[PDB]
Design a protein around this motif. Structure first.
Motif, mmCIF file in Angstrom:
data_model
loop_
_atom_site.group_PDB
_atom_site.id
_atom_site.type_symbol
_atom_site.label_atom_id
_atom_site.label_comp_id
_atom_site.label_asym_id
_atom_site.label_seq_id
_atom_site.Cartn_x
_atom_site.Cartn_y
_atom_site.Cartn_z
ATOM 1 N N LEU B 1 0.594 -1.257 0.491
ATOM 2 C CA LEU B 1 -0.012 0.587 -0.082
ATOM 3 C C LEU B 1 1.414 1.451 0.092
ATOM 4 O O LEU B 1 0.532 2.190 -0.585
ATOM 5 C CB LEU B 1 -1.135 -0.062 1.261
ATOM 6 N N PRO B 2 1.894 1.286 0.267
ATOM 7 C CA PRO B 2 2.881 2.619 0.210
ATOM 8 C C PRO B 2 3.431 2.625 -1.137
ATOM 9 O O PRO B 2 3.021 3.884 -1.881
ATOM 10 C CB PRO B 2 4.664 2.576 1.269
ATOM 11 N N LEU B 3 3.470 1.436 -2.394
ATOM 12 C CA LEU B 3 4.593 1.410 -2.900
ATOM 13 C C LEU B 3 3.369 1.339 -4.440
ATOM 14 O O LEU B 3 3.324 0.865 -5.498
ATOM 15 C CB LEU B 3 5.198 -0.255 -3.542
ATOM 16 N N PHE B 4 1.583 1.568 -4.241
ATOM 17 C CA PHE B 4 1.118 2.224 -4.965
ATOM 18 C C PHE B 4 1.021 2.892 -5.730
ATOM 19 O O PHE B 4 0.539 2.865 -7.121
ATOM 20 C CB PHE B 4 -0.388 3.049 -4.345
ATOM 21 N N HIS B 5 1.948 4.344 -5.705
ATOM 22 C CA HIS B 5 1.932 5.204 -6.338
ATOM 23 C C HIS B 5 3.176 5.353 -7.618
ATOM 24 O O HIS B 5 3.063 6.360 -8.143
ATOM 25 C CB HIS B 5 2.076 6.772 -5.197
#
Ligand SMILES: CCCCCCCCCCCCCCCCCC(=O)OC[C@H](COP(=O)(O)OCCN)OC(=O)CCCCCCCCCCCCCCCCC
Ligand SMILES: [Ca+2]
Lengths: 100, 48, 48, 50, 49, 48, 50
Positions: B1-5
């Motif tokens: 969920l942090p590596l989404f963008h």
């Protein structure tokens, strides 16, 4: 075209029957059967007991290509029948083993 | 969920370089050296 | 209670070996050991 | 061998005269294994051996 | 009737699209086995002979 | 040819595996490029 | 046989020594031949000197 289960028992029954026609015109001299195959898990001990109990026929087994299938049973068949064993991995290996 | 963008940014570059590389490079690589009158492709021993 | 979870956790490590000795063979061919493993698949399925 | 660009692949053992006096006549019978495992490089080799 | 040329079988078909120009395939090794009933016109009074 | 004494003379290569399209080459006993034969070349290989 | 007969070649493989023969032309053979010795054919993929 290659497809289907290997059966060395129906392959050597069909071979021996072919060998016993005696109606046709025949050489009637050296009777030999040679099989080209890669690896065998079954030695087919039963077919050779009767069809060639006295070893009239000679069996030559050829293992061909680069593969991992077991060659012990094929070698055993060759040894049992007073034949020989020949590997062929390559095209340049065909010419001296199919004359040997 | 942090590596989404980050993953969404790789996907608007694999798309951008595809439509760039379509418009420039489409249909160019269809010619090879062939032996005269054969369909046999000619190479040197260690050339793809 | 306590080993009930581990008798079926031991069962599944036997299933993972039962997939790792399946030898894939081309064009619908088999050997003896893959014919005694497909029966085993049935045995494994029933327990689960 | 290499002074022209045609190269001989002649073997004495292969020759018919050599063969008739090598051995006695014979009724052979080639079996070919056509199971699925053979298909591949190996199947290609068998057609050229026979 | 017997001749030097080798006895031939079939209708010869070679594919020009798959002979690369400088490799030299095998030429021939077969024996010239013409039969008596093929060197001359066949009868029934010649198969007796 | 498994050893050096046998790896002499010439041999055939077959192009695209056709057993009709063959060409002489001399055979020669070649040593590998990156290899393990002393500590120095074994560290050269390991780095790669 | 199947070796260059040119004198200036001198390959001289180990173990062996060649002959330059003189090669009269002949009838009953429609080729030049030498009656002083026998030629030797080695096949091509067979190494001589083994
Ligand atoms: C240093 C740390 C070790 C890194 C691994 C390098 C080891 C490579 C080596 O040992 O060289 C052996 C090399 C093999 O020789 P050989 O294959 O037998 O060939 C015979 C002649 N053709 O024998 C040779 O002839 C080649 C020797 C060349 C020496 C390598 C040069 C190294 C210089 C590195 C300095 C850079 C420092 C930066 C560090 C930042 C790293 C985070
Ligand atoms: Ca098989």
């Amino acid at each position: 075209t290659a497809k289907g289960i290997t059966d060395y028992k129906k392959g050597f029954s069909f071979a021996f029957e072919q060998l016993l026609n005696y109606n046709v015109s025949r050489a009637n001299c050296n009777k030999i059967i040679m099989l080209f195959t890669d690896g065998g898990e079954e030695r087919a001990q039963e077919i050779f007991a009767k069809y060639n109990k006295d070893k009239k026929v000679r069996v030559f087994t050829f293992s061909v290509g680069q593969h991992n299938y077991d060659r012990g049973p094929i070698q055993w068949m060759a040894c049992e029948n007073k034949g020989y064993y020949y590997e062929i991995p390559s095209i340049g290996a065909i010419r001296i083993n199919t004359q040997e | 969920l942090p590596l989404f963008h980050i993953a969404l940014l790789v996907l608007f570059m694999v798309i951008i370089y595809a439509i760039i590389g379509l418009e420039l490079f489409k249909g160019k690589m269809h010619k090879t050296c062939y032996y005269i009158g054969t369909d046999i492709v000619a190479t040197v021993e260690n050339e793809k | 209670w306590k080993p009930f979870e581990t008798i079926i956790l031991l069962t599944i490590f036997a299933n993972c070996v039962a997939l790792a000795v399946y030898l894939p063979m081309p064009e619908d061919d088999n050997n003896s050991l893959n014919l005694g493993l497909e029966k085993l698949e049935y045995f494994f399925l029933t327990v689960f | 061998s290499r002074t022209p660009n045609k190269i001989d692949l002649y073997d004495v053992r292969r020759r018919p005269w050599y063969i008739q006096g090598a051995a006695s006549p014979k009724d052979m019978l080639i079996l070919v294994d056509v199971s699925g495992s053979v298909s591949g490089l190996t199947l290609k080799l068998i057609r050229t051996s026979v | 009737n017997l001749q030097p040329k080798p006895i031939g079988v079939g209708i010869p078909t070679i594919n020009l699209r798959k002979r690369r120009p400088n490799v030299q395939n095998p030429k021939s090794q077969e024996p010239v086995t013409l039969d008596f009933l093929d060197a001359e016109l066949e009868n029934d009074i010649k198969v007796e002979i | 040819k498994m050893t050096e004494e046998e790896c002499r003379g010439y041999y055939y290569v077959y192009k695209d595996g056709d057993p009709t399209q063959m060409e002489l080459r001399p055979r020669q006993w070649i040593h590998n490029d990156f290899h393990f034969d002393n500590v120095l070349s074994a560290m050269m290989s390991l780095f790669t | 046989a199947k070796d260059d007969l040119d004198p200036e070649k001198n390959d001289s493989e180990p173990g062996s020594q060649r002959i330059k023969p003189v090669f009269i032309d002949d009838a009953n053979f429609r080729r030049q031949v030498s009656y002083q010795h026998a030629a030797v054919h080695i096949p091509t993929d067979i190494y001589e000197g083994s």
